[PDB]
Amino acid sequence: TARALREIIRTARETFKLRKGKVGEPGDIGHYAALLDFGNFYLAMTTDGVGTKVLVAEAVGKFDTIGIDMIAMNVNDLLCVGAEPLALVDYFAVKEPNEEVFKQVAKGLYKGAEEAGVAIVGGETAVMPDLINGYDLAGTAIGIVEKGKVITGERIRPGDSVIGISSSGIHSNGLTLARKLLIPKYGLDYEYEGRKLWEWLLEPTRIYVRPILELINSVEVHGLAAITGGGLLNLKRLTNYGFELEMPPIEGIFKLIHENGVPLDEMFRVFNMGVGFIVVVPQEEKEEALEILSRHYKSYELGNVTRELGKIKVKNYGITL
Amino acid sequence: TARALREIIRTARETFKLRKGKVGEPGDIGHYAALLDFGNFYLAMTTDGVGTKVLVAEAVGKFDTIGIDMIAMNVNDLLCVGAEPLALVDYFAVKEPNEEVFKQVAKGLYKGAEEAGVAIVGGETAVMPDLINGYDLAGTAIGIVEKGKVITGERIRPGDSVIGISSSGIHSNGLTLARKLLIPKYGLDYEYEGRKLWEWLLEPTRIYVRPILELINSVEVHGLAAITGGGLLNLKRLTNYGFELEMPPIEGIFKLIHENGVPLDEMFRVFNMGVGFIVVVPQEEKEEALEILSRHYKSYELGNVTRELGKIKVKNYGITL
Numbered sequence: 001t002a003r004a005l006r007e008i009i010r011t012a013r014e015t016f017k018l019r020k021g022k023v024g025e026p027g028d029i030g031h032y033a034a035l036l037d038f039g040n041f042y043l044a045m046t047t048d049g050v051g052t053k054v055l056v057a058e059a060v061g062k063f064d065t066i067g068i069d070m071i072a073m074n075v076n077d078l079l080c081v082g083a084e085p086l087a088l089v090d091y092f093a094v095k096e097p098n099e100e101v102f103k104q105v106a107k108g109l110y111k112g113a114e115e116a117g118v119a120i121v122g123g124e125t126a127v128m129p130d131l132i133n134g135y136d137l138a139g140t141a142i143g144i145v146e147k148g149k150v151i152t153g154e155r156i157r158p159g160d161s162v163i164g165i166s167s168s169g170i171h172s173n174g175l176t177l178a179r180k181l182l183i184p185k186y187g188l189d190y191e192y193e194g195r196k197l198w199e200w201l202l203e204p205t206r207i208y209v210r211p212i213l214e215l216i217n218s219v220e221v222h223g224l225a226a227i228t229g230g231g232l233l234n235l236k237r238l239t240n241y242g243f244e245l246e247m248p249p250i251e252g253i254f255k256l257i258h259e260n261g262v263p264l265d266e267m268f269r270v271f272n273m274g275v276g277f278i279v280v281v282p283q284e285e286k287e288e289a290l291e292i293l294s295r296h297y298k299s300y301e302l303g304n305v306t307r308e309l310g311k312i313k314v315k316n317y318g319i320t321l
Numbered sequence: 322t323a324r325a326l327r328e329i330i331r332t333a334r335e336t337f338k339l340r341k342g343k344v345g346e347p348g349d350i351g352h353y354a355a356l357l358d359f360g361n362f363y364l365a366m367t368t369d370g371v372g373t374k375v376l377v378a379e380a381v382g383k384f385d386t387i388g389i390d391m392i393a394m395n396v397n398d399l400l401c402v403g404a405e406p407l408a409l410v411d412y413f414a415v416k417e418p419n420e421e422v423f424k425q426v427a428k429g430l431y432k433g434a435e436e437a438g439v440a441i442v443g444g445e446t447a448v449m450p451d452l453i454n455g456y457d458l459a460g461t462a463i464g465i466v467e468k469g470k471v472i473t474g475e476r477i478r479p480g481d482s483v484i485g486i487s488s489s490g491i492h493s494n495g496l497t498l499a500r501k502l503l504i505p506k507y508g509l510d511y512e513y514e515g516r517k518l519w520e521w522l523l524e525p526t527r528i529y530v531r532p533i534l535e536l537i538n539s540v541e542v543h544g545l546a547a548i549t550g551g552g553l554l555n556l557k558r559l560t561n562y563g564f565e566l567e568m569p570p571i572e573g574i575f576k577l578i579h580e581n582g583v584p585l586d587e588m589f590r591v592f593n594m595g596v597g598f599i600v601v602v603p604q605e606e607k608e609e610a611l612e613i614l615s616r617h618y619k620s621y622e623l624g625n626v627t628r629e630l631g632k633i634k635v636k637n638y639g640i641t642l
């Protein structure tokens with residue numbers, strides 16, 4: 001995967017010079033979004049799909065929230081460079097132009113867009129039954145951040161406070177592993193802690209736009225990280241410094257997954273494990289930050305930045321990533 | 322397909338108010354790209370995938386042109402509102418991370434981006450074998466257009482000259498019909514007019530950024546249309562006025578398709594039939610427009626706009642769409 005992707009990454013970096021010194025000149029690839037120089041401001045650009053979670057939605061005929069996942073994936077990435085999300089286009093590659101599915105998808109697209117404060121301004125619909133075994137939903141979002149107000153993690157210093165905002169659940173990463181491990185063993189209707197397995201797998205991703213925009217307009221912020229592919233390893237994209245964390249207890253779907261063989265170190269590398277978004281602020285602003293975030297979502301002090309470069313220590317679990 | 326899409330379109334229109342009176346306020350859905358009000362200028366945004374052409378690519382192992390198809394699909398759409406393409410992200414949804422496939426894909430991505438003058442600033446790579454029976458490659462492009470320089474077709478009037486720029490071949494629409502009709506009977510190694518069928522089907526989509534940007538900066542232009550899904554029906558997106566046209570002779574892959582039982586009136590609603598891009602100019606600019614475009618690609622005077630609303634007459638073929 002990394003060897004295959006490197007070919008595209010290297011080609012992409014080569015094309016940067018086509019906009020050198022011109023409107024749209026990019027920064028480097030690697031962060032949660034691209035930053036494009038528009039003179040007075042940066043434009044942020046990101047793209048992501050929902051993933052195989054759509055296979056669960058199709059099974060129970062509930063696409064009412066897949067659109068929330070898609071918008072969440074994209075606007076939460078815009079936040080991680082300090083950008084205010086503005087607009088989105090959706091790429092909907094489907095096996096069939098089913099009017100019932102499309103009606104369900106539209107409902108969540110509105111709900112997500114409302115929560116994020118963005119307009120859905122266009123898109124593409126590709127009926128490709130030979131290529132698509134379901135209803136793949138992806139999107140591309142753009143946002144804006146003023147020059148001088150970009151947050152990429154370069155300000156992170158040892159001793160900074162690390163705060164986690166709770167997730168709504170599995171969100172949109174690790175779905176294939178969870179599906180193949182749990183569905184054939186327990187059945188989609190398996191009731192676990194009052195919710196069916198498909199209810200655990202379909203829980204829409206949380207949208208962090210409002211608490212994070214409030215936070216960056218109120219306190220000093222040194223880093224912002226959506227916990228997606230790679231789980232806690234996403235923190236290393238922000239800085240070479242280390243992290244000393246205490247993660248919340250494993251429960252819900254994550255407990256179920258863990259009890260079915262998956263080791264905890266792999267799980268902190270795959271699932272958000274209850275923390276959907278992480279902010280890094282100076283210790284001076286920790287209490288103020290907790291209060292702003294905790295108005296909107298249950299939020300924790302996870303730990304501190306350390307000088308153990310490149311290491312993430314989950315102390316209460318005896319794990320280093 | 323139209324009724325299913327109506328659900329998302331109406332919902333996306335409802336989200337416009339979330340950006341009303343703000344940076345990024347959108348125009349209406351329906352055109353080749355969306356236009357977002359950034360004050361001194363509009364930002365153009367569009368997204369599109371390659372389509373089932375990637376299935377032919379996988380069948381024969383030739384992947385170094387679908388990356389051109391993806392970039393062409395998106396930058397040619399930005400041209401159709403008068404915008405200069407700036408930047409693109411790509412969405413690569415794959416059954417597996419085959420390093421050979423990704424190396425080929427990156428070659429075409431570089432060639433396309435260099436021809437269009439865009440930087441590939443980021444992207445997404447998603448391995449989902451349960452969902453994707455191949456290598457689905459899509460993208461999202463961003464462009465810029467000044468206030469008062471947008472070209473939508475609103476200025477098209479009866480009498481206007483209609484000019485077509487030759488396509489390189491099938492481009493990226495109608496591939497599903499072409500696949501199911503030709504591949505079982507002939508196979509991808511069948512030679513037609515000195516070229517293998519896979520050479521016909523994988524010829525990369527032409528990029529029109531250079532001739533079109535030169536054109537709108539030189540003469541008055543009333544309409545621009547990439548000839549994609551629905552073939553010549555795309556002209557009806559620019560205006561309700563009619564068209565009287567003389568289309569090029571049916572040659573190459575289109576003749577082979579026609580001769581295998583596809584009627585001519587269906588082919589003009591599916592394939593570009595040799596015309597990849599159409600521009601509408603006032604008669605007084607016709608010669609100068611032909612001159613600029615002929616410096617880049619073979620270009621034709623196709624005909625004129627008429628007062629026979631809602632119809633496209635292909636006179637030399639006796640067809641009315």
Ligand SMILES: Nc1ncnc2c1ncn2[C@@H]1O[C@H](COP(=O)(O)OP(=O)(O)NP(=O)(O)O)[C@@H](O)[C@H]1O
Pocket residue numbers: 005008009012029030031032033034047048073077173228229230411412413441442443444445446
């Ligand atoms: N196919 C691609 N083409 C170009 N850039 C890509 C591609 N895939 C990934 N990238 C870039 O590589 C970096 C890492 O990508 P990715 O791992 O998708 O980040 P993410 O979106 O934060 N994680 P996730 O939401 O789990 O996919 C980003 O800056 C992307 O822009």
Ligand SMILES: Nc1ncnc2c1ncn2[C@@H]1O[C@H](COP(=O)(O)OP(=O)(O)NP(=O)(O)O)[C@@H](O)[C@H]1O
Pocket residue numbers: 090091092121122123124125326329330333350351352353354355368369394398494549550551
């Ligand atoms: N899933 C979608 N969500 C939102 N808008 C959409 C969606 N699909 C299509 N649209 C919009 O509907 C209009 C027509 O779409 P489309 O038929 O894809 O245009 P095109 O890209 O010019 N043609 P093609 O290249 O053949 O796909 C555009 O303005 C799109 O932005």
Ligand SMILES: [K+]
Pocket residue numbers: 031032033046047048077444
């Ligand atoms: K991203």
Ligand SMILES: [K+]
Pocket residue numbers: 352353354367368369398
């Ligand atoms: K488009």
Ligand SMILES: [Mn+2]
Pocket residue numbers: 047048073077228
């Ligand atoms: Mn992401």
Ligand SMILES: [Mn+2]
Pocket residue numbers: 123124125368369
């Ligand atoms: Mn399209």
Ligand SMILES: [Mn+2]
Pocket residue numbers: 369394398549
């Ligand atoms: Mn298109």
Ligand SMILES: [Mn+2]
Pocket residue numbers: 047048444445446
């Ligand atoms: Mn991604």
